[PDB]
Structure formats: C-alpha cells, structure tokens
C-alpha cells in the first residue's frame, strides 16, 4: 500500500500506536491531560447557569488573526515569492492579452474584405 498526500495511510499501518515506550507514552498522557484541562473548561463553561453569551472560542480568534491580520507583519520578500508573485499577477494577464488582440485583429481584417459576412445580427 503506497500512500500519498491524499489517501493518507491509516493508523493501523504507520508504526505509531505500537511503541509503548516510557518517552513515547508520556507524550500521549500530557498530550491528553491538556485535552482534559480543556474539554473540562468547555463543559464547565458550556452548561454553567448564567453563561448567557456564547463560548468565545479563542482558538478560532487566533486562527482568523493569523490568516488575515498577521500576514503582512510576517512578509519578507524573497525569491520563490516575487518571481512567484509576478507570474501570478501579470502572467495570465499578459497571456489573455495576446489571446484577445489576435481575435480582435483576426476578426477585424476579415471585415475589411467581407470574409466575415455577418449573420442576422443586431447585438453589434
């Protein structure tokens, strides 16, 4: 079974979950004792009488800030980024220009003879 970035391989392959080691097992404990400090803080805050508003969910607020207001403060113009940032803005924008002017010029010269005898058109 050959994995990929998609169709990723399951847990039952991929030799984690097997090595019950003193240093590999302590991770799963404190990686989960933080998951129970936290579920707890939600369950204690979810059904609390007088919680009236919603659960603020700061892990989602750290996500949106990271994605729309912490981007330009972490921008360093390198290569792989500016050639990458010019092929994307001007690349197709220059591609289509040589696709339309050719059509407009193809279409135009065909008028100048009459080789594009126009069908029963009014749309101009």
């Amino acid at each position: 079974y050959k994995p990929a970035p998609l169709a990723t391989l399951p847990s039952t392959l991929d030799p984690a979950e097997y090595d019950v080691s003193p240093e590999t097992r302590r991770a799963q404990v404190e990686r989960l004792s933080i998951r129970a400090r936290l579920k707890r803080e939600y369950l204690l805050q979810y059904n609390d009488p007088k919680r009236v508003s919603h659960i603020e969910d700061p892990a989602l607020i750290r996500w949106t800030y990271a994605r729309s207001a912490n981007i330009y403060p972490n921008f360093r113009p390198t290569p792989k980024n500016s050639l990458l940032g010019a092929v994307a803005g001007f690349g197709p924008l220059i591609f289509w220009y040589y696709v339309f002017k050719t059509d407009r010029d193809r279409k135009e010269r065909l008028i100048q003879e009459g080789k594009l005898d126009r069908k029963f058109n009014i749309s101009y």
Binding site: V52, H54, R67, S68, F100, S123
Partner: protein
C-alpha cells in the same frame, strides 16, 4: 428634482426638532414618503429626457439610481435602530443627520448635468462615509480603512479634477448634453491619451479593479451595518455612472486603450470570486463578490455596445439590493454573536427558519437565478463580451462555476448542519430586521417584472 431633495433637506431639522422616542418613527416614516416623490421621474413618456433646471436633469440611467438612493434610506435608517440603541440622544440623531446627507448629495450627483457639480458631490459624499465608519465601527481597524477609503479615492479623483478643467478651457461649458453634441474626435496623441487615465481612473477606483480594491474589504468589514449598504449599493455604482457619461468624449481611443482594464477585471473577476470561496469572515465575503460583479461593469463600459450598458444598469442596481440585503442577513447575526466569522454559527434554520428563506432568495440573487435581473445583467454583459471576443466565456464561465459555490457555501455553513448549541444568545428574529429583507426582495420581485424601467440610455 428640487422637489425631491429639498424635503430631504427638511428631514434634517426634523431629527433635531423631534423628541428621541418619536424621531426614528418620523424620519423613518417620511423617508418612505420621499421615495414616492422620488419616483415621479419614471414618467418618461418620450425620449425627451427630463431636463428640469439648468443644473439638474434626469435620465433613464440616473432615474433608477435616484430611486434606489431614496429607497435604501428607510431601509438603512431602520437597520441601525438596534445598533446604537444604547448611546446618547445626540449621536442617535447625528448618525441620522449624516445618513440623510448621503441621500441629498447622491441625488444631486445622478441629477447633475455637469461633472464639477458631480465632482464636488463625488467627494462630498465622502465626509458622511468616513464619519460613519470611524465613529461607529465596532473594531480597532476602523481607522486604517477610513484612510484607505479617503486616499485610494482622491489619488484617482484629483487628476479627474485636472481633466474636467481642461475640457472647459477647450470648450467652455463642461456639461453633459452639449459635449455629447460638440464631440470632436481625438488624435490618439500621448498628450491626448493620458487624459483617459485622468477622466477614467477615479471611477475605476470606485468600481474596484483587481488592484486598488483594498479599500473595499477594509471599509465594509468595519462599517457598522449601513456604511456597507451605501458603500456597496450606490457609492460603488457612483463610479460606474460617470464612466457612462464621461466616456462619450473619448470614444475613438478607448477601442485599444481599455484592453488592460477590460482584462484586469475579467481575470480578477475570477480571483476575487475564487477568494470568495475560501474566506473566513462573512462581511469580508459579500465584498469580494461585489468586486467580481462590478468587475463586469468595468468590462461593460469599455465595449460601448448598447446591451453592455443594459447589462450594467441591470447588474449594478440588482447587485445593489442583494448586496445590501446580505449585509442585513449577516448583521442580523453579528447583533447576536458579535463575530463576523462564518463557521462560528453553522447550523441555523433550526432557530431562524424564516430568515433562512431570505438567505436563500438572496444567494440566488447573488448568483444568477434566471427569471431575475442579476442574470439578465450577467448575460447581456456576457453576450457583448462574446461579440467582443468569443473566448471570454472561458473566463465568464469559470466565475459562474465559482459563483454557484460560495453563494451556496454561505447557505451551507450558516444555515445547514448541526446547530451551535453553545449559543443561548440567538434571539429568533425581531420584526424589524425581518422586514429589512422584504424591502430588498419584493423590489427585485417587482423590478424583475418590469425591467423596462431599469435599462439605460440605449433601450
């Protein structure tokens, strides 16, 4: 025309001459009653356009924009009733003394026969918008966008102030309905060629290209509920309106010169709509959709075919009502959760059953649902572009393929799924933010029925 604005001048004392618990009702009451007075100028029994005064006038292009501007007022005057509910008496009147100035100034723009009176009102509509955002915005970044909105615009508008003056010195009067007659062609000269950028870009700042549009998300996201309506509904269109006007005196040298901005729109008319797929904030999402659609107007005026203008008035105004609608739909949740994000509330329609019908009918106005005026707007523009070049549909089609996704995905991840049962603060619906949506759609339901009214100069 004076009959229409001079009352709007007189709504402004009425706010200050009315007690607090009786002034919303009145200035809401009569602002509808202005709309009727603002609606007599559909009496266009002949092609002889309605030239009331030596400065004012009317036009089958302006007349929709006149009437829409008076119809968003009661709509928006009412949407800010629960916003700024707890505050001082005076701000609760001053926001109204400012949100009426937009009615007066904008009606004086589309009524205008000249460009300077339009110019000084092109920008005098900016004082009542920078002031709404920065003084009632619920976010820290309210100021960074007010600067953007202030300064993206003027950089394009001050060369416009240099070309309008020059056309006077060449002609003398500088108005519409003379320059359309004294329209001497141009010699394709570098001197005579930067004039395009002068008298075209201020209007392409407002209709946002795929470049300068950064004021469009930053301004919406921060405007409370109503500096996004007028900022999208009409002010966003106020750029388009001038380009239908001023493009008459430059028609020989826009055949070739518009290939950038016929094309800087069509490409970014996909990019914005593609961004619109993968976006978190909900009020940042109607914005990018509004660039994708007004990008089709930028690629309308630059073909100058008659249907292309028809496909712009039908797409501008139609976008003006579904856009202002969706903000009400979103701010009908921000008043509850106080967050713009689109995943925080993902399972409504168990709780807001009837509002879901307004999200639905609005999304279908957002996309092209045919027996309508958005699709009629997104179609005649598609037909002009086909005639322009038959390889535009490879672009215009990808947006349609996209535009059916986000306008559904907005329906999915806010009204379909498991409810967010950690929200006790979902009050079902006020009767007041549930007639806002009626004052958008029933117009579309009716304006769809007689879109002979909504066409422009050509038809």
């Amino acid at each position: 025309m004076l009959k229409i604005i001079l009352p709007s001048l007189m709504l402004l004392p009425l706010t200050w001459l009315s007690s607090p618990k009786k002034t919303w009702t009145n200035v809401t009451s009569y602002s509808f009653l202005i709309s009727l007075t603002s609606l007599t100028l559909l009496w266009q029994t002949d092609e002889n356009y309605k030239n009331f005064s030596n400065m004012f006038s009317s036009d089958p292009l302006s007349t929709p924009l006149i009437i829409l501007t008076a119809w968003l007022l009661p709509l928006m005057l009412m949407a800010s009733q629960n916003h700024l509910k707890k505050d001082n008496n005076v701000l609760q009147k001053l926001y109204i003394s400012m949100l009426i100035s937009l009615q007066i100034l904008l009606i004086m723009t589309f009524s205008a026969t000249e460009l300077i009176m339009f110019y000084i009102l092109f920008e005098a509509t900016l004082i009542p918008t920078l002031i709404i955002i920065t003084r009632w915005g619920n976010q820290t970044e309210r100021l960074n966008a007010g600067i953007y909105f202030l300064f993206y615009t003027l950089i394009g508008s001050i060369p416009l102030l240099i070309a309008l003056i020059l056309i006077q010195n060449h002609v003398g009067t500088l108005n519409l309905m003379i320059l359309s007659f004294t329209t001497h062609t141009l010699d394709a000269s570098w001197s005579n060629n930067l004039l395009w950028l002068a008298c075209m870009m201020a209007f392409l700042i407002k209709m946002p290209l795929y470049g300068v549009h950064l004021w469009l998300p930053k301004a919406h996201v921060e405007a409370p509920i109503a500096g996004s309506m007028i900022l999208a509904a009409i002010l966003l269109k106020l750029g388009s309106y001038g380009m239908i006007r001023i493009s008459i005196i430059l028609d020989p040298l826009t055949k070739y010169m518009a290939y950038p901005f016929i094309l800087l729109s069509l490409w970014g008319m996909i990019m914005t709509s593609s961004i619109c797929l993968r976006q978190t904030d909900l009020k940042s999402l109607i914005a990018y959709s509004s660039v994708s659609h007004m990008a089709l107007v930028i690629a309308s005026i630059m073909i100058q075919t008659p249907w292309s203008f028809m496909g712009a008035t039908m797409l501008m105004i139609a976008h003006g009502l579904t856009s202002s609608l969706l903000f009400c739909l979103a701010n009908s949740n921000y008043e509850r959760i106080h967050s713009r994000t689109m995943i925080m509330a993902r399972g409504l329609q168990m709780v807001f059953p009837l509002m879901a019908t307004w999200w639905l009918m609005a999304s279908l106005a957002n996309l092209a649902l045919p027996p309508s005026i958005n699709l009629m707007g997104e179609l005649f523009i598609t037909m002009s572009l086909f005639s322009w070049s038959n390889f535009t549909i490879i672009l215009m089609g990808i947006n349609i393929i996209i535009t059916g996704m986000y306008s559904m995905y907005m329906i999915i991840t806010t009204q379909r799924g498991k409810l967010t049962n950690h929200m006790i603060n979902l009050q079902p619906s006020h009767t007041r933010e549930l007639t806002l949506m009626a004052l958008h759609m029933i117009p579309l339901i009716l304006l769809t029925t007689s879109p002979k009214l909504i066409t422009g100069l050509t038809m």
